Amino acid sequence: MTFPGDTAVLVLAAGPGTRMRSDTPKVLHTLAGRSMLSHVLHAIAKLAPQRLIVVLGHDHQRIAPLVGELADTLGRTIDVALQDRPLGTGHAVLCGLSALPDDYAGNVVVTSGDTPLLDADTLADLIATHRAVSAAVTVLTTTLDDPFGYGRILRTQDHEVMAIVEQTDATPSQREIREVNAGVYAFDIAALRSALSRLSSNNAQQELYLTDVIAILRSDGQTVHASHVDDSALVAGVNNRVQLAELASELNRRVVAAHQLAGVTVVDPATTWIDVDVTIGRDTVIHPGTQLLGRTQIGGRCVVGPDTTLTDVAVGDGASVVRTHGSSSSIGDGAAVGPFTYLRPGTALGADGKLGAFVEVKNSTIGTGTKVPHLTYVGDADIGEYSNIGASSVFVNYDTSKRRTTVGSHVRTGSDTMFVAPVTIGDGAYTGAGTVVREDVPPGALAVSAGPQRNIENWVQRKRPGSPAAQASKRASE
Amino acid sequence: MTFPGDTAVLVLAAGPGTRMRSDTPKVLHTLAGRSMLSHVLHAIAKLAPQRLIVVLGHDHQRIAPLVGELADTLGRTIDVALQDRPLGTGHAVLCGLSALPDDYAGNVVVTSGDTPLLDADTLADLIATHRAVSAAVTVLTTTLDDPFGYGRILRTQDHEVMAIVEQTDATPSQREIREVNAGVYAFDIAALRSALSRLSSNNAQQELYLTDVIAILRSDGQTVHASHVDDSALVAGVNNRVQLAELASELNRRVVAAHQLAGVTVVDPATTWIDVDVTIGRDTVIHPGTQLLGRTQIGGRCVVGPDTTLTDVAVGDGASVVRTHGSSSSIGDGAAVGPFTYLRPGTALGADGKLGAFVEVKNSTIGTGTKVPHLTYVGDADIGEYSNIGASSVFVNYDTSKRRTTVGSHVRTGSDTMFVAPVTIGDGAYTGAGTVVREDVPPGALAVSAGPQRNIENWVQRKRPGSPAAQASKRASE
Amino acid sequence: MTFPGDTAVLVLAAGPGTRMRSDTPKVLHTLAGRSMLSHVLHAIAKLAPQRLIVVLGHDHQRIAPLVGELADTLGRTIDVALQDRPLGTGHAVLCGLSALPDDYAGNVVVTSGDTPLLDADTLADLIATHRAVSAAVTVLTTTLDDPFGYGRILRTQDHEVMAIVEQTDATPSQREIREVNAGVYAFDIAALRSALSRLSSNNAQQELYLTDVIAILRSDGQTVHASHVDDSALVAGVNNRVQLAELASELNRRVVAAHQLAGVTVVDPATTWIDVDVTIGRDTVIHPGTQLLGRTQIGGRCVVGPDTTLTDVAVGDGASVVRTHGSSSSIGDGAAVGPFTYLRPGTALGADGKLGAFVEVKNSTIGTGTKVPHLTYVGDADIGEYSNIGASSVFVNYDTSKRRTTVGSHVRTGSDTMFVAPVTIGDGAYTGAGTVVREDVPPGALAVSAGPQRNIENWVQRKRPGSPAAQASKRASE
Numbered sequence A, B, C: 001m002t003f004p005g006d007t008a009v010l011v012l013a014a015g016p017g018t019r020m021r022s023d024t025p026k027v028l029h030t031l032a033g034r035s036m037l038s039h040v041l042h043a044i045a046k047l048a049p050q051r052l053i054v055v056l057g058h059d060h061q062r063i064a065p066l067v068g069e070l071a072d073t074l075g076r077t078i079d080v081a082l083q084d085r086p087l088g089t090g091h092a093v094l095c096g097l098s099a100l101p102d103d104y105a106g107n108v109v110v111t112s113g114d115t116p117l118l119d120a121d122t123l124a125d126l127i128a129t130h131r132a133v134s135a136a137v138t139v140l141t142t143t144l145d146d147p148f149g150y151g152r153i154l155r156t157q158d159h160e161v162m163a164i165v166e167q168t169d170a171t172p173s174q175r176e177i178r179e180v181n182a183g184v185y186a187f188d189i190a191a192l193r194s195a196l197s198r199l200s201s202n203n204a205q206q207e208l209y210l211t212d213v214i215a216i217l218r219s220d221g222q223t224v225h226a227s228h229v230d231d232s233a234l235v236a237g238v239n240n241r242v243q244l245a246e247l248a249s250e251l252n253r254r255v256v257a258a259h260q261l262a263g264v265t266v267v268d269p270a271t272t273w274i275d276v277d278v279t280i281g282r283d284t285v286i287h288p289g290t291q292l293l294g295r296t297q298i299g300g301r302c303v304v305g306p307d308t309t310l311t312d313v314a315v316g317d318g319a320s321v322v323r324t325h326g327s328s329s330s331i332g333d334g335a336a337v338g339p340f341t342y343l344r345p346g347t348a349l350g351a352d353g354k355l356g357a358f359v360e361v362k363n364s365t366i367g368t369g370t371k372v373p374h375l376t377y378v379g380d381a382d383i384g385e386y387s388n389i390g391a392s393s394v395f396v397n398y399d400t401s402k403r404r405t406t407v408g409s410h411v412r413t414g415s416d417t418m419f420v421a422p423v424t425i426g427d428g429a430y431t432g433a434g435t436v437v438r439e440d441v442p443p444g445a446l447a448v449s450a451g452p453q454r455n456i457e458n459w460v461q462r463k464r465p466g467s468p469a470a471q472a473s474k475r476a477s478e
């Protein structure tokens, strides 16, 4: 942050990713609310290289679209190079180069589409070191407890880099090496072209190994330079779903920490999932088993969770959102939502409103200070202020009617009222318990439909004789 | 996988397990859906020894039954040796031997009933090494950060094994040894009998230590061989509930990983509990706070969780099961269940069906494409296809009547309908909101019981004067 | 446990705690159900020093009250020293000394208000070592992977302590030191006064560093002694919310372990939060995603969770409390609560009672063997024994009426009954489904209000023509 020039970045993304066992292209799997690809491109764009090229393989029609979207989001131009068949990483670099002017003179940085955690600094350091050491190729390495599967970096006691050897081609002895190839490079474009031209597919994998390039350039008498990255997580890639979840977990730790340091109490970081676009205000407390997803925004002094999932929800200041499942909705200041509350898209709850337990709202607006405390569904309706919706009620329209039920302010509807849409209820109106409202109700009016209660006096003895409820017999002689 | 012959396995399980502080025999505590005992016997049977014997103690009537069950499940014969009083591990081995022909000539492998994670390879390697080194006794060891409580393996600089010393009998110096006895052995039966005969109870515990046997056989000039196990977890035992939860956690990690590698996305492995018999199809996504228990089976391309608990539930392909608690039930392809949904035993939901929020179903069948979206209980009933059960409804029978309410296809029942079982509703029937159905309803018919809505016009002012709902007064002059 | 005399303890708590980014004083943030301050004072009081003094800063009116409360709770006297401005830790010690008689002769122990995990032993060892070594000052140290931010303890090869150097004032070389100052001290009061008098504010922070005192006393030719604490967590302090959550997590591990060792099965310790005052009986099983808060007490042989949150709830023996959110309530032996159940303050559920799914109770008593199984709200009411409250019902009073609805024993109320408070229902009474009870109901009586079901026979064809529910047409010709 930022890059020099002219710098061109290739992002290899044309591998089959068979180890994911997925019918969804590897780079499109997500963590923290962005696909791996989106993560990679966001970091790269922040460095603003002259050219940004994504090498894609056979399923490129499924991916190029996303790339164009990111191009626009990122305010820049991102090109696509094709590689019909995965003949190797080296071959992929060729294809990606084919999208540069044959006379390109800038540095060529190579990275992968499956390293979500890679950051601006690590890249900027990479090129900087590459220029300082006047290297023909610079390669990022890191050390792993288990180096299995990755390229072993061969050094002489000199610490001089000799070559990179793949897991498949390595000897048992070489496999003990725990310093591995990160797969992030900086090249002198001419040396890169030269070296690539000479690759051979005589491998355990019979492919064209981009990694062979550090060996040919050693042998060319060129400057070959490795650069160790300590924070190995930054350089970690995703080849299967085990590694996906580990990177997800690790990214999540960093996002949660940042929030904690900015004044957010997270009781249980290991159990609080927060996407990268989420914002949270000061002195807010998040309880365990909570996930805040998409573009969710929480104000200050809120209490969220436990066991709460919010996608693209906006929460004002001083609100409580407990054991709630919700998406695309707004909760105003000092509102109380939960526990056991479901908000569907389109829900807007005003300041000091209350959505209680076993309440669901979809596409509804609920005015300041209004309470829907119990066992109620509110669909496609607008409610006013300081009203009180009785328990066990339902606002529903049997459709595709786009007419909305309307309820005024200071209303008090009775337990078990069914509102058949579309209907209009006036300010300070009441409804009787067990009322079916099919007709508008005037301000100050009382709507009712329930019949009068009648008592059948010795009914249990007569029509349920001998039962335990022959405890009426006990009660009588007492 | 598999074993040589003749090989006889003793499983010591006759200890009191006092450190569990439980009124339930240690080996019967569970993890990942099997008792420790069931885990142990499953691994052993896979190796198919000639003889399999379980030594049990005083509460053997509570355990022998389970053993016979496992015998049948495992397709083999498992014997029981008794040890009335826990006089020691050595003594337990005697008792277990008493169930072999006095002239038994095979190798005797000894293991414990409290090591759930022990695997086939570790055992097969054990006997193999025992035969190769022509050992009189071979003993599995491993190294622990905290070796507290376990037998210290004493070696000379030779790496030669000299003896095993128990925590209780060890010196402060010996206690620093971090290589410990795993309690898994292979014996030459004759040397074992010989050695056991000579044990003495002159201990800190005043018991007959099976471990003394490696010392007497050293002194006998017999071949004594230790075999180190690196993956210490495999050899970890459960003596208290701290260790139980650690092994549970570790087993769970391995089960989740396997699923991830086979193409299942688990967002949060630390918070996803999956029993050993559960199956999950490709590209399925499991969200945090989910447990899949018993013989639950999930198809492909499903979304399960967050906060979902399924025991013996079957889920087709492309289904969503979110914030659901359920057991012994089936959810067909493309069905949507949750959030906040409860399925009790006997529930069968057809393809493309929907069980919504704050819905409970027990012992009911629900046809293809049928929706029960809100606040409804469906008990002991059968519903047809493409129907729509209105919110806030109840299907209940006041019993022990085994007659089932029946609802046809393309039905649309109105909000707040109570169905008193047993009743039959015909295809394309409707019910009015707030209807109590006690009588059959013919196809194409409309059932209703609710009264007409009536409005009492200035009622709030008259019977609740001065209230905030004197906002009718405001409304009138506006 | 216990302390010698005369021993005086100063608790520094007058720092601004800016790194918390909180409008709530650092020492008042909580973990495991106690503020850091309450944790600190509880441990100190258990040692019973002659004098206990808390140094507070500008917001002391917000804290001194809590201190007085703890004074009473702890059965002792705790004084407050003021320090108007945070001029440094050394300066804070002065202020705290100002609350001792000018001729005080006892030892002075200094500790911080932000070290929740500090235990009795570590303190008792501190003074004991201080007296043994006849030290003028003894200082607790510990070793950290990341020593960032803490005072580096400078030793000569002698292991002799030379000085403590702060992060801000340390050299890059000194910063590599990973042995750090714990900020827990024991002093000879005279040497302490002497040394403090000579402090200088010529610092990177330009403050009066209590830490300089170990240097002046070295230079005084006094005895200076460091004491290493291995369990670094005991000596860990909270300066930001990252460290808060880590200590919370670590404390929680220790509390859960203790319970496990006393015979409580916790399936998932990392996901089970248990406050310090909670009690749990033998053979109880706690499932993942559970938090037991405040003074919650669980009997024996219970099943609690998953996804259960209890604050100050009392649970008898053999009860199941599953996916329940509850506070200030009681659940009797063998009761079944959940899943998806909400208990508000004042709820008392008798033995063998059942609160089912999507049920909420507030301030209500529910007799032995009574069942409220589905979709019901029970507010401010008293129910008798072996009754059965039908699904989809509501007990609610439209208020501030303190009269309580009353229901007798062996009652069976029908699905969709609304009870308008206050009302009285007699033993063995029944209610019809869809009944609005506004009037008392006599024993053995049947209350009803619902109208008779009527059928409109070809209604779908007539008033919804062409619809899919023209499957009545199909049904007719079949």
Ligand SMILES: CC(=O)N[C@H]1[C@@H](OP(=O)(O)OP(=O)(O)OC[C@H]2O[C@@H](n3ccc(=O)[nH]c3=O)[C@H](O)[C@@H]2O)O[C@H](CO)[C@@H](O)[C@@H]1O
Pocket: A012, A013, A014, A015, A016, A017, A055, A083, A085, A086, A087, A088, A089, A090, A091, A092, A112, A113, A114, A149, A150, A151, A152, A164, A166, A180, A181, A182, A183, A209, A210, A211, A237, A239
């Ligand atoms: C380059 C090589 O020989 N091996 C390196 C490669 O191993 P590894 O075998 O992991 O390389 P992959 O097969 O993951 O591919 C690396 C990147 O190149 C892409 N790709 C691969 C082949 C292809 O024909 N087209 C294509 O675009 C992949 O989509 C991926 O984005 O990366 C590791 C870091 O994670 C390094 O330690 C290895 O030394």
Ligand SMILES: CC(=O)N[C@H]1[C@@H](OP(=O)(O)OP(=O)(O)OC[C@H]2O[C@@H](n3ccc(=O)[nH]c3=O)[C@H](O)[C@@H]2O)O[C@H](CO)[C@@H](O)[C@@H]1O
Pocket: B012, B013, B014, B015, B016, B017, B055, B083, B085, B086, B087, B088, B089, B090, B091, B092, B112, B113, B114, B149, B150, B151, B152, B164, B166, B180, B181, B182, B183, B209, B210, B211, B237, B239
């Ligand atoms: C055998 C011995 O002296 N000590 C070993 C024993 O310690 P440890 O003291 O853990 O042995 P336990 O008391 O757990 O018993 C070991 C096994 O033998 C059974 N049992 C024990 C006593 C008895 O009289 N009857 C009986 O059947 C127990 O149920 C258990 O299945 O196992 C440890 C491994 O976990 C080893 O490191 C110790 O060196």
Ligand SMILES: CC(=O)N[C@H]1[C@@H](OP(=O)(O)OP(=O)(O)OC[C@H]2O[C@@H](n3ccc(=O)[nH]c3=O)[C@H](O)[C@@H]2O)O[C@H](CO)[C@@H](O)[C@@H]1O
Pocket: C012, C013, C014, C015, C016, C017, C055, C083, C085, C086, C087, C088, C089, C090, C091, C092, C112, C113, C114, C149, C150, C151, C152, C164, C166, C180, C181, C182, C183, C209, C210, C211, C237, C239
């Ligand atoms: C004392 C000092 O120079 N540095 C020590 C201080 O660092 P550190 O910089 O962490 O010290 P803090 O600023 O946290 O304050 C330490 C304690 O003293 C209190 N306080 C501080 C300043 C003040 O003017 N008034 C006041 O009461 C704080 O509220 C806190 O309770 O504690 C660390 C342990 O956590 C040690 O490793 C450092 O060597």
